[PDB]
């Protein structure tokens, strides 16, 4: 899939809210896939850690319902899913293992250049 980031920032169910906030401050990501090794087990967002004690573990806060896409799908399918579900990031998994991630932020900038493009083709 195009517009896929292979350097995914993930967390484990045993990491604490405190360490996740440090990942947010470091990587500027507002959400992370939860993994056991590379196997996707959940998703966590900035909204989930609102008012949560910093010692709380991720596994008790994360959502186990995780929407994902396959590397065989296109960036336009991921854009459609993120627009339909209202989410800002979409993990890309293959055989249950996270192989990448697609952000709504990247595809929103990809739509702009597409409009900037296609005026040279006339």
């Amino acid at each position, epitope marked *: 899939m195009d517009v896929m980031n*292979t*350097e*995914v*920032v*993930t*967390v*484990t169910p*045993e*990491m604490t809210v405190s*360490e996740v906030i*440090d*990942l947010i401050l*470091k*990587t500027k990501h507002l959400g*992370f896939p939860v*993994v*056991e*090794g*590379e*196997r996707l087990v959940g998703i966590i967002t900035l909204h989930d850690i609102i008012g949560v004690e910093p010692e709380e573990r991720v596994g008790n806060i994360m959502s186990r319902e995780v929407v994902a896409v396959s590397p065989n799908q296109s960036a336009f399918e991921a854009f459609k899913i993120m627009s339909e579900m209202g989410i800002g990031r979409l993990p890309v998994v293959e055989h249950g293992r*996270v192989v990448g991630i697609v952000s709504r932020s990247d595809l929103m900038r990809i739509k702009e250049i597409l409009e900037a493009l296609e005026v040279m083709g006339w």
Partner: nanobody, 117 residues
Framework: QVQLQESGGGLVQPGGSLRLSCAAS????????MGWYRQAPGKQRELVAA???????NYADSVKGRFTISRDNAKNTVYLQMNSLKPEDTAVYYC???????????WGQGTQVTVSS
């Protein structure tokens, strides 16, 4: 900014032990998460273990328990201790660095580990 240099590795008997080492250099390294990936002869790259600056570990299920990872924060060095090694553990082991439970931003040249009778 960031460079990784593997160390150790070689031929080991089935059920034996082996310790891999990796030192991170460069002014760009700043308590990054460090980990180990491996690639079997005919398979894709695959996570072995990883550890963050906070000390949080993450293991692939196939190596869980048999392998242990630790890191010296002052020396920017990560260690992978392997025990009860199996022939299926034979692969090129790459040292990685980045952020989170699966750091993939920077890579080393890799080191060979062969487990066979």
């Amino acid at each position: 900014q960031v460079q990784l240099q593997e160390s150790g590795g070689g031929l080991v008997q089935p059920g034996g032990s082996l310790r891999l080492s990796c030192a991170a250099s460069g002014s760009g390294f700043n308590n990054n998460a460090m980990g180990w990936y491996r690639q079997a002869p005919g398979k894709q790259r695959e996570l072995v273990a990883a550890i963050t600056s906070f000390g949080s570990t993450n293991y692939a299920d196939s190596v869980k328990g048999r392998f242990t990872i630790s890191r010296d924060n002052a020396k920017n060095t990560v260690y992978l201790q392997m025990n009860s090694l199996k022939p299926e553990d034979t692969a090129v082991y790459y040292c990685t660095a980045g952020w989170g439970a699966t750091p993939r931003s920077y890579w080393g040249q890799g080191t060979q580990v062969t487990v066979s009778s």
